[PDB]
Design a binder for these strands. Sequence first.
RNA 1: GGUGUAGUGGUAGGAGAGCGUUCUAAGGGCGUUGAAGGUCGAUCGUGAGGACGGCUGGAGCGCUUAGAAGUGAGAAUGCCG
RNA 2: UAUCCGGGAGUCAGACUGCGAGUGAUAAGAUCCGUAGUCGAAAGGGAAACAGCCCAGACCACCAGCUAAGGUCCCAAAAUA
RNA 3: UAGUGAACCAGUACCGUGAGGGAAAGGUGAAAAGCACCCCGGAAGGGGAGUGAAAUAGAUCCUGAAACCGUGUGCCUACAACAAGUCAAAGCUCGUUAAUGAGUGAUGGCGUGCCUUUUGUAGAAUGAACCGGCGAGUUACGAUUGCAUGCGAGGUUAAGUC
Lengths: 111, 147, 118, 53, 49, 101
Amino acid sequence: ITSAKATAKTVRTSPRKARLVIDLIRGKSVADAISILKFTPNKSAGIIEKVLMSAVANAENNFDLDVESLVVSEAFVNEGPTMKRFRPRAKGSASPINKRTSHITVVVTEK
Amino acid sequence: MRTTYMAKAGEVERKWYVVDATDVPLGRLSAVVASVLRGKNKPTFTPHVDTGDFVIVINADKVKLTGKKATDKIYYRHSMYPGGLKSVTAGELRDKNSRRLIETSVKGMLPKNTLGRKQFTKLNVYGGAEHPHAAQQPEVLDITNLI
Amino acid sequence: ARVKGGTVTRKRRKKVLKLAKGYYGSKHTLFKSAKEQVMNSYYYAFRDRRQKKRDFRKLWIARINAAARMNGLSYSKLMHGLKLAEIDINRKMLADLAVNDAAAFTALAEQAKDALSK
Amino acid sequence: AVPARRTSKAKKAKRRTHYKLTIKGLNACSNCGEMKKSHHVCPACGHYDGKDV
Amino acid sequence: MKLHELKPAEGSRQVRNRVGRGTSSGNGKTAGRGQKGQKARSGGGVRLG
Amino acid sequence: MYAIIKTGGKQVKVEVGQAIYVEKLNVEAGEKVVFDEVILVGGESTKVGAPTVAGATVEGTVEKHGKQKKVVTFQYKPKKHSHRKQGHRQPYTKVMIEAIN
RNA sequence: GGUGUAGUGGUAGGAGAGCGUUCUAAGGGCGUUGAAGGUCGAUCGUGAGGACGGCUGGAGCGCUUAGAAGUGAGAAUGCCG
RNA sequence: UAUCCGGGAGUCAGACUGCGAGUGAUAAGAUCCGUAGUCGAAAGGGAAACAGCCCAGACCACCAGCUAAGGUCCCAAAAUA
RNA sequence: UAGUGAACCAGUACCGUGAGGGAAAGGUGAAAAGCACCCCGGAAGGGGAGUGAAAUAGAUCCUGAAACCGUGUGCCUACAACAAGUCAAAGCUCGUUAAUGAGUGAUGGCGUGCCUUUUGUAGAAUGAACCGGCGAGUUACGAUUGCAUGCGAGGUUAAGUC
Ligand SMILES: [K+]
Ligand SMILES: [K+]
Ligand SMILES: [K+]
Ligand SMILES: [K+]
Ligand SMILES: [K+]
Ligand SMILES: [K+]
Ligand SMILES: [K+]
Ligand SMILES: [Mg+2]
Ligand SMILES: [Mg+2]
Ligand SMILES: [Mg+2]
Ligand SMILES: [Mg+2]
Ligand SMILES: [Mg+2]
Ligand SMILES: [Mg+2]
Ligand SMILES: [Mg+2]
Ligand SMILES: [Mg+2]
Ligand SMILES: [Mg+2]
Ligand SMILES: [Mg+2]
Ligand SMILES: [Mg+2]
Ligand SMILES: [Mg+2]
Ligand SMILES: [Mg+2]
Ligand SMILES: [Mg+2]
Ligand SMILES: [Mg+2]
Ligand SMILES: [Mg+2]
Ligand SMILES: [Mg+2]
Ligand SMILES: [Mg+2]
Ligand SMILES: [Mg+2]
Ligand SMILES: [Mg+2]
Ligand SMILES: [Mg+2]
Ligand SMILES: [Mg+2]
Ligand SMILES: [Mg+2]
Ligand SMILES: [Mg+2]
Ligand SMILES: [Mg+2]
Ligand SMILES: [Zn+2]
């Protein structure tokens, strides 16, 4: 009743690289987090920004919370399903390639 | 019953002793001082807790070296660079840096661990008969019978 | 009549892991490393249940020696004197008195010195 | 050369200690008050040094 | 006798001994065959006589 | 006041109103037990048994009989495909000290 | 069952006695008022191991006696994931 | 305790130490025997560390005691006897 | 991971010039009642609202272990040389199958993994990246010995018929 969460599942991005941007914004006011994500050039910044804006929209529309008070109480990236691929190498062999996916969760609380 | 007394850090009082090294063999002085620093002279001795007393050594320049140790006892140390072995005779150490002589002797007799190094810090050596620790109200510690 | 692996294997390995709880990283997480460390822990524990008695007797002897020196006597002289005086108080009780009841330990030392003199 | 021993989680995390991002130079824009990078045009209002561009 | 209380005569039946099922059983690992040699191989041993 | 008594091949310090754990005593719970081998009595004065204080005794009541935490003896020799596991729970008697004489 | 005496390191290996797994028969039971399974716990036995409670789970499963084995894994540059 | 009768094995690479010989050079942690011990298959204490040396054979619990080899100024228990 | 290679569009996909070789892959719910409508988003995916007994049963759908990854934090950690434990232990934190409790642990003592093969291995000899599953003295017919049962100078049926 005081918090709202948004999740983006099976997003094609490195969980570790995404966790870098998530560490930037964790435990910050929603406005500060939005600014940080907008000015971060890393790819996951935009995806995390969409999830954060979705969470804020949930907090407002679904639960009628005060936007100005909102802060990023929790945020994390879990590993998702990994697609298997193969890259040919020299001398007629192949090496596996792990195309990773991420479950990005953002939880925003009133205070 | 598991009732053996175990000392705690800070509860036990550490006194301050003054030891005169004048014409006392280096090793025997170091041995008595090492026991005192470890706290082996007090019933409350606890091996895993520091319980010994501070020691101030005076007249370190007059410590005794029997035999030819003054010229033949050689202290080595390696810089860890190739061919980086350095030496200095015990007599030269006594003449120039007596504090180092006593401290090296006592280091050898203290345990080689965290507690041992902390106990070593409680040592204070001074060539000459005067020390700056009058504020600690140290008391003389006769050792003639302890050596 | 086929008997598949079932749950017995998991039960056994989980027992080992619970014993290994608190170990560093893989030593508490992985069954094989956990079992090896638990075996070494058993070896050390059996050995230490015997070393522990040695260590405490050693500690009591040291404390009794300090108290005896303060009373004007060596540990060896004190024990010999107590044996002569027929005192059977053991080293655990002697060290306890030295730390706690200095007066009682002093009385014991006086009796030991008297026996030695005789 | 190949890793003689696998890298444990603790050592791996220690090495990644310094593998972190940073965000610097953000401060309020004069024209609209939104956050902007210093010495850069405020992307929202397109103003810099108090003028539109 | 009752089917829920059957009881063989004492010593009439014994338990089969299974080898290669742990060290503490006394027949683990080598299964009582020893170490190496011809008799330690599957189908090992020389013909009778 | 306090006493030191000989019990179970070991010497224990005892004070009135204190519970002590000793090797199993062949006595029922809630029954009186008397330790008649007092090797010392201390307090305001000191009585030193040589080896035992004459006519000195300590009284107690057997509160409980119990078993200590299990001890596991696991003997094995590396590379010799051999191990032996054993459990133990030493019985004990908890006795409350009532009187020291 | 009690007292006494003596004994109780152990590889190859021999002997004895047991734990646990799946299934069969009989008897006696347990389960949408929650089985098996999973997970947690500071529980019991001399050992393999056995209970009990919380949570998860959603339909089968113990117990006693006897019987039959695809009956116990940590290693095989083992196989598959 | 020995025989005998029968069921089941494993073993046929040994090592060192002391003593008595050979081969060797009166060398080898060499080699080959005889003999005794230990290791092998033996944990514990001493020899700094150190399978084979010295003392000694772990069924277990104890924050009890006496000793063996070896030790008692400090590391480090015990004599600055 | 069993059972036919194949419980499923399998001798298929795939591999090979060809003969030939040859897989993986079962489970929503009683019933699709398979999430109308609204909100963020380009979508994907979510948050509400609903269906349902249950949606952390939402189609990667029963259960959902371990490795592996991540979040939060009760305790410890930047003078320390560590087969990582064990024995002793202050401090701090917590209150259990209520037990002479639990977690963590400054500090001190002791201490060179497991397996294989060896006279001898911490071994700078061998094997294991980790976790999970599978994976090795069995059966048939005979021989012989022990144990047990029935009968006993006797014992016993085989094929075959019902
Ligand atoms: K055999
Ligand atoms: K393997
Ligand atoms: K010989
Ligand atoms: K479900
Ligand atoms: K953690
Ligand atoms: K330690
Ligand atoms: K090699
Ligand atoms: Mg090519
Ligand atoms: Mg298995
Ligand atoms: Mg002893
Ligand atoms: Mg059978
Ligand atoms: Mg055997
Ligand atoms: Mg094995
Ligand atoms: Mg083999
Ligand atoms: Mg061989
Ligand atoms: Mg053989
Ligand atoms: Mg079942
Ligand atoms: Mg099997
Ligand atoms: Mg495996
Ligand atoms: Mg030789
Ligand atoms: Mg061998
Ligand atoms: Mg030995
Ligand atoms: Mg060995
Ligand atoms: Mg024995
Ligand atoms: Mg003695
Ligand atoms: Mg000493
Ligand atoms: Mg669930
Ligand atoms: Mg599921
Ligand atoms: Mg330093
Ligand atoms: Mg520090
Ligand atoms: Mg060799
Ligand atoms: Mg390897
Ligand atoms: Zn602006």
